[PDB]
């Protein structure tokens, strides 16, 4: 019935520092993160279990309390399993291939398209259709996924450019 | 569209509204009825605008009730005419209205349809209004 | 809550006179898959068989408190209880087993029910 | 569209205030609305 009261197990190996005030430096094989936390929140570490508690039932605190748990769960999973977001290109002549760390995109614009990933992020291209942006940061992987989407806004009339897998673009009837 | 067959005088004083309604505050002829929160003049055309809105949405159903028959003329001097030089002429008619009065009534209608017919009337009427039901202590 | 008592008292009346029964998982319970079982009930008998998926631990397990005290282990997750009135046992243990083997709903590897004081292994 | 009296049109519509301005959002683009 509530969000932040729920326990979060640590599969391991993920250590969690409790440095003030308040910075949480999660660490592990995949990477590290330091989410900002205002003092009113109270994070505690049970053995292999992160915990969160609400100072009061006030409506402002009710909103912030449910966010802090969801972020920490996003943090640990990126330090372990990691994250990725597919992108289904659709069309005829559309294609994509890397040139160094940079990701060239042969979008239908006459101008060549290029996007540079930020550090800690890589973009493999297993196929010309699919696109995969691996990364330990959900906020960043979803941001890069948006920036790539920005190159081509989807057309309701026809499947073209970037498209989430899977998602149903609204059908339109031309004439 | 409702006008008197005859009136004793062609014109009358505009008057001064104040206080609770003299009567008719309690709906009973109909299962439900609109009740004004304040008081303001209502032209005859405004009344016709409300009843037409209900007859379409109601479709088949019980007869619309109208507790209020207009009787007080509103004077309307012709445009650009200078002040004074006689009183103007009654362009139309306006019913006196008091707060808490039952402006309209409806009966024999299902509870869902009744909520809407009272609502559309509320927009045609400048006065703020509220949903009302019959009381039976009783 | 009076309606819930009808859910309880009636099914207990069957279990007091019940002979045999079998575990059935509710996952992927296609309506067509149910009809194939319901037609088999028409051969074995009529309305006397019961499908009732009232399988809450707070529900059917309380009915098991009087008799059949082996349902406590089978209680977690999806269940589809069956009850017999008359009908000498035979095909009822066998017919449902044949269905799950040909796709259509997981059998749960037959957790088993009352027959003696045992569980697994339909006969 | 922008009207002072934004209202839901269908069941899919949802009322959500944003930046001090109430906005109704729906799976159908036409039903999207904002007051003020």
């Amino acid at each position: 019935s509530r969000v932040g009261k729920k326990l979060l197990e640590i599969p391991s190996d993920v250590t969690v520092t409790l440095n003030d005030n308040n910075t949480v430096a999660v660490k592990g094989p995949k990477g590290e993160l330091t989410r900002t936390f205002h003092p009113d929140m109270e994070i505690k570490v049970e053995d292999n279990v992160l915990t969160v508690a609400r100072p009061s039932d006030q409506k402002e605190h009710r909103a912030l309390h449910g966010t802090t748990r969801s972020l920490l769960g996003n943090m640990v999973e990126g330090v372990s399993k990691g994250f990725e977001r597919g992108l289904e290109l659709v069309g005829v002549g559309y294609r994509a291939s890397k040139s160094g760390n940079k990701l060239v995109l042969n979008v239908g614009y006459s101008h060549p398209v290029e996007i540079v990933p930020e550090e800690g992020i890589e973009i493999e291209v297993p196929s010309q259709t699919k696109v995969v942006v691996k990364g330990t940061d959900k906020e960043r992987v979803g941001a890069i996924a948006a920036n790539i989407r920005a190159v081509r806004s989807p057309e309701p009339y026809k499947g073209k450019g970037i498209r989430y897998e899977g998602e149903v673009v609204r059908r339109k009837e031309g004439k | 569209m409702l006008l008197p067959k005859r009136v004793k005088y062609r014109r009358e004083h505009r008057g001064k509204m104040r206080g609770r309604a003299k009567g008719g505050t309690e709906v009973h002829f109909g299962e439900f009825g609109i009740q004004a929160l304040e008081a303001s003049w209502i032209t005859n055309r405004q009344i016709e605008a409300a009843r037409i809105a209900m007859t379409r949405y109601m479709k088949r159903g019980g007869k619309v009730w109208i507790k209020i028959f207009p009787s007080k003329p509103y004077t309307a001097k012709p445009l650009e005419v200078r002040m004074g030089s006689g009183k103007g002429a009654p362009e139309g008619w306006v019913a006196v209205v008091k707060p808490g009065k039952v402006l309209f009534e409806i009966s024999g209608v299902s509870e869902e349809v009744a909520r809407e017919a009272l609502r559309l009337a509320s927009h045609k009427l400048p006065i703020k209004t509220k949903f009302v039901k019959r009381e039976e202590i009783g | 809550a009076i309606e819930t008592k009808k859910v309880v008292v009636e099914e207990i009346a069957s279990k007091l006179k019940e002979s045999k029964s079998t575990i059935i998982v509710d996952y992927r319970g296609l309506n067509v898959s149910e009809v194939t079982e319901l037609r088999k009930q028409l051969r074995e008998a009529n309305v006397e068989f019961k499908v009732y998926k009232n399988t809450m631990t707070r529900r059917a397990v309380e009915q098991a408190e009087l008799n059949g005290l082996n349902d406590f282990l089978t209680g977690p997750n999806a269940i589809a209880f069956s009850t017999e009135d008359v009908v000498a046992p035979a095909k009822v243990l066998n017919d449902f087993a044949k269905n799950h083997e040909a796709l259509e709903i997981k059998a749960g590897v037959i957790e088993g029910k009352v027959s003696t004081v045992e569980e697994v292994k339909a006969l | 569209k922008v009207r002072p009296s934004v209202k839901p049109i269908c069941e899919k519509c949802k009322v959500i205030r944003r930046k001090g301005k109430v906005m109704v959002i729906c799976e159908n683009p036409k039903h999207k609305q904002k007051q003020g």
């Binding site: - | - | 009809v35 319901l38 028409l42 009529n46 309305v47 | -």
Partner: protein, 133 residues
């Protein structure tokens, strides 16, 4: 699986069957003899037939009874029912006559019992506005 109302007495020309089952990979020449076989017992009637489609292009068919409530017009003795049922009780039928009708529909009906098969037909007789007596 594509259901169709192939006539019992005839099965060969393209426009009723043809491509519609020919795109299913069905071998039309080999089954038309089968439609004329079992359905010969009820010639002159339009018999619906379910058609399952196996991956191996093997096929098995299941014939069905002529459509329900058409029989009700015969038992009533009237060619057509009221356009205003119950409000206009044009026709009446005995309960025993309904028993003769329900038995014919048994292979088509999914009804568990003959007593239940009665109740199924009773919902059809009311559609004609016919009284149940």
């Amino acid at each position: 699986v594509v259901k169709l109302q192939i006539p019992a007495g005839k099965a060969n020309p393209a426009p009723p069957v043809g491509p519609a089952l020919g795109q299913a990979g069905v071998n039309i020449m080999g089954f038309c003899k089968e439609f004329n076989a079992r359905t010969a017992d009820q010639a002159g009637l339009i018999i619906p037939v379910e058609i399952s489609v196996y991956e191996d292009r093997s096929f098995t068919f299941i014939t069905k009874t002529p459509p329900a409530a058409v029989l009700l017009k015969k038992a009533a003795g009237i060619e057509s029912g009221s356009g205003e049922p119950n409000r206009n009780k044009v026709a009446t039928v005995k309960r025993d006559k309904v028993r003769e009708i329900a038995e014919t529909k048994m292979p088509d009906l999914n009804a568990a019992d003959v007593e239940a098969a009665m109740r199924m037909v009773e919902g059809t007789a009311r559609s004609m506005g016919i009284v149940i007596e």
